[PDB]
Amino acid sequence: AGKEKIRKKLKNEIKKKGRKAVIAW
């Protein structure tokens, strides 16, 4: 998915942005 990608879910796909997406950055 892409909203709750189980990470956008904000696991870390965008933790917060992974940090600043630093899971993408």
Please give, one letter per residue, the 3-state secondary structure of the chain.
CCCCCCCCCCCCCCCCCCCCCCCCC
- Domains of the chain, by residue range, sit at 1-25
Cβ distance 1 to 10 under 8 Å? no
| Longest CA span, the chain | 20
Residue 21 vs residues 2, 3: alpha-carbon distances, Å? 14, 14
